[PDB]
Amino acid sequence: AQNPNCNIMIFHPTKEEFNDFDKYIAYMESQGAHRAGLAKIIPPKEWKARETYDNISEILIATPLQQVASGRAGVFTQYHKKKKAMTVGEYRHLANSKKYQTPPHQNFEDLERKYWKNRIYNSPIYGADISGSLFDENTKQWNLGHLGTIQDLLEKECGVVIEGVNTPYLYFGMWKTTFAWHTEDMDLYSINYLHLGEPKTWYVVPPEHGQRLERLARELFPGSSRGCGAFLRHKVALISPTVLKENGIPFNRITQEAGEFMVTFPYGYHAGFNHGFNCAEAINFATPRWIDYGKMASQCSCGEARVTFSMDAFVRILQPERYDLWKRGQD
Ligand SMILES: O=C(O)CNC(=O)C(=O)O
Numbered sequence: 001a002q003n004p005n006c007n008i009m010i011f012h013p014t015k016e017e018f019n020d021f022d023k024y025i026a027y028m029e030s031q032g033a034h035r036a037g038l039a040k041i042i043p044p045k046e047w048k049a050r051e052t053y054d055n056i057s058e059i060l061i062a063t064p065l066q067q068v069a070s071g072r073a074g075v076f077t078q079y080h081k082k083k084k085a086m087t088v089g090e091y092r093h094l095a096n097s098k099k100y101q102t103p104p105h106q107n108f109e110d111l112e113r114k115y116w117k118n119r120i121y122n123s124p125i126y127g128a129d130i131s132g133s134l135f136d137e138n139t140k141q142w143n144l145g146h147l148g149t150i151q152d153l154l155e156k157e158c159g160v161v162i163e164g165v166n167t168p169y170l171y172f173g174m175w176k177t178t179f180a181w182h183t184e185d186m187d188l189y190s191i192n193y194l195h196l197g198e199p200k201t202w203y204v205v206p207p208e209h210g211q212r213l214e215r216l217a218r219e220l221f222p223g224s225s226r227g228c229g230a231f232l233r234h235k236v237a238l239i240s241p242t243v244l245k246e247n248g249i250p251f252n253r254i255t256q257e258a259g260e261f262m263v264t265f266p267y268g269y270h271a272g273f274n275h276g277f278n279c280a281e282a283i284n285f286a287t288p289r290w291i292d293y294g295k296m297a298s299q300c301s302c303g304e305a306r307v308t309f310s311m312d313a314f315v316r317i318l319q320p321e322r323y324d325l326w327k328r329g330q331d
Pocket residue numbers: 171178179190191192200264270280282283
């Protein structure tokens with residue numbers, strides 16, 4: 001068995017290996033990369049996502065979200081308070097202001113210590129989930145707006161044609177902006193490219209151990225667990241590495257820098273935070289190996305998780321017994 005300790009693997013494809021996206025994902029899996037839940041892909045030196053980032057300031061963040069925490073430093077939830085629209089240039093100036101800027105630090109480990117100690121005492125503002133792309137149309141390799149669609153994969157594997165579309169999303173972050181513990185919708189893969197700016201630190205639980213994280217979360221968030229049998233789908237709960245180690249939960253951590261891709265694998269729980277002003281692009285995707293995970297994915301039916309149009313068909317075809325209850329949650 002390849003990668004039996006479930007370590008995060010880092011890949012350096014050549015320009016020739018960067019041509020065929022599906023083939024390279026399958027290669028990484030042949031080496032055991034999926035067992036970690038997360039892999040890093042460093043593009044060949046010949047590649048670029050676009051020529052410059054000098055002309056992005058006029059992108060609008062229609063609904064910036066202020067991430068307000070409740071709880072204790074290592075075990076907390078966050079809710080998202082909606083703020084007035086602002087441009088990417090306006091948000092960048094805000095991120096760099098004395099109230100929001102990254103503090104002085106020695107290295108990534110010192111910054112990580114500061115994040116866990118102090119996050120709850122601040123409310124950073126995140127531009128999330130903005131439909132769009134920063135890849136140049138002429139970039140042919142690993143262009144997250146030109147991937148094979150999940151609807152086409154389902155149709156190729158299972159023969160059923162379904163409605164829905166699959167497009168990328170932009171994230172504009174600042175110091176302390178936080179992504180809560182989650183797997184993807186329908187336990188899909190994700191791919192995330194850090195276009196510019198400061199790093200993003202990730203934490204991940206191997207897919208084979210995901211239920212250990214779920215049992216800890218039910219213990220730590222007991223009201224939320226009574227409310228919903230899949231409350232991590234709400235994407236609001238944070239648990240620190242120190243608390244995970246205290247409770248014997250297997251995990252790994254890695255820091256992504258600008259110019260690097262991360263891939264999350266089916267049922268790989270992940271969480272993390274941004275170091276300072278940055279911009280990332282991400283999209284979900286599928287492969288043949290995903291289908292069995294899609295069929296077994298948990299679902300939130302309490303009403304909180306509310307998701308995209310295209311998840312309807314995935315539930316309807318892969319999980320027909322659950323469909324009626326899930327759809328009641330959506331309506
Ligand atoms: O970058 C973020 O805020 C969160 N991204 C992801 O969870 C991802 O790419 O799967």
